[model samples]
Target: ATTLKMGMQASVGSVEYNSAKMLADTLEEMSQGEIKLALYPSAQLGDDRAMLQQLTLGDLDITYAEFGRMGLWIPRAEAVMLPYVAKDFDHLRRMFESDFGQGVRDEMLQKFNWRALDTWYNGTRETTSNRPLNSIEDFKGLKLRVPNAKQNLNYAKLSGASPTPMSFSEVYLALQTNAVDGQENPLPTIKTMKFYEVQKNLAMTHHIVNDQMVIISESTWQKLSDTDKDIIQKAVQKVGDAHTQTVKTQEAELVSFFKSEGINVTYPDLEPFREAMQPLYKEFDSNIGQPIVSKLAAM
Candidate 1:
């Protein structure tokens, strides 16, 4: 194939967007004008679900999506998203390279036919709200907006908050209109989405970590020669590696930026939040497999 399309809901400033463009640019150079990747940013194509649907049906080429979103198809994949499953970013990336992570990817291919080329650490998720949350008790009765995923929904419930499922596009309005009391995401996401403008209190929960996987639709993959497929994967992997470090630095720098903008930021004790989410870990043990979680925890 001479051309392909890439999709993402990430805004212009997000590493996802930049990385997608980087993939296109690098691939274009490496392929010597033979192969190309066009980008659809800010959901110009559609939401993650719509993009995934298009991908499955051979309507799109590639997209960057969270494992949780993919979990909607393969329930077992949800284990990769278990709250605090990894000790840190280094551990998370290592887990992705581990057999357990590879198994999840293999099942994704077997079940959905989407090829996961590589994973890039997205960011560590934290809570944002208008009300101060200094402790887990503060989460009580809070209506938190979460993506429509079992793990994300249960995360709110476990933290003593009401989990309200909402699309990413609607979160800012939901918070501004009091439709939801709070939301959760990485520091860069909160800043990029301008969620900081709608909410005042930022609680550093670092609840569940997230990573964006480079997935290609089966139709697109079928069109590629083995050599071209290797080229594409290598290009994606190259950009993905650099994107991880960029996000790590961006997240750290954004914390200070958020504070400068008048957002009250605080790091609450993570032990309570982790303790409360234990039931969810158990609840998903059967689905995601105990051994996977056990191996990850041991990491």
Candidate 2:
């Protein structure tokens, strides 16, 4: 019998936790108790970057992370994190199934000794503000809180907002004290963190379609039998499909709930917002290659 350790940052009851739990149960059942997973949620192992480092060193067997973290090793991986790089969840999945996505997986294996098993949808990011943002001009000079990632910071700048990079723990106070004018996140996150209680307007920016990849250490994978490898892949893909649907359904329900709570929700014309991101797109093209960028655009 073998027990593999799986770790993630999401706490109990989050979609990530539920999906990972599903994978654990399915793997153990399919392997007939020959293989088991020891689950560690709520960042018990450490942050995503720390866990990723452990995987590279073969100290951790399995974990998941977004493109921004992967980009630290392979810079081109961050291209997927650029604003509007993926129009929606469906389009994001197609991008991963494309040749460029294959190259990313190959690079990770050859360079970092990590195997990317599959992708799981996180959620699309939307904006919540102290005031309504109906036009691009409305963003000019507005103070916006964004994660410290370069891509997010640039997105705020290009959208004409004064970007204030801050940690997730600091945001609620910032919003409450009027230290920042707005912030962006998925609907479920906004609800969980109760950001809606402080902000009055919710703008459907849909700026970034976030996703995380299930990754295993290459050494750990090599130790597995062919049958076990097949089982793991099947379990991950099946759980990933269910995870996407769960997130989508939750997002649909959150809109009405926010409106009922007196948060003015608006769907602004996203065409101009998308158009404003072109310069950032070209910058990414220069780094990730024009061919890959063109393929993502066509998709």
* Count: clashes, candidate 1: 0
lDDT of 1 by residue, 1-299 (tens): 38898888887877788888888889999888889988888888878888888888877889887765666876666666778776567777677777867877787777676888888888999999889999999999999999876777887888889999987878989999999999999887898889999999999888888888889987789889888898898998889889898889999999899899999998899998888877777767765456656666786
Give the per-residue lDDT of model 2 (tens digit) for 140-255. Answer: 98899997677788778999999999866678899999999999988877887788999999999888888888999998999999999999999999998998888889899999
- Among all candidates shown, the one with the greatest TM-score: 1
Q: Which candidate gets the maximum lDDT versus the true structure?
A: 2
Candidate 1 Cα outliers beyond 4 Å, as residue runs = 286-291
How far out, in Å, is residue 135 in model 1? 0.8
Pairs clashing within candidate 2: none
Off by more than 4 A, model 2: 176-178, 287-291
For candidate 2, the 10 contiguous residues with the lowest summed lDDT are 287-296
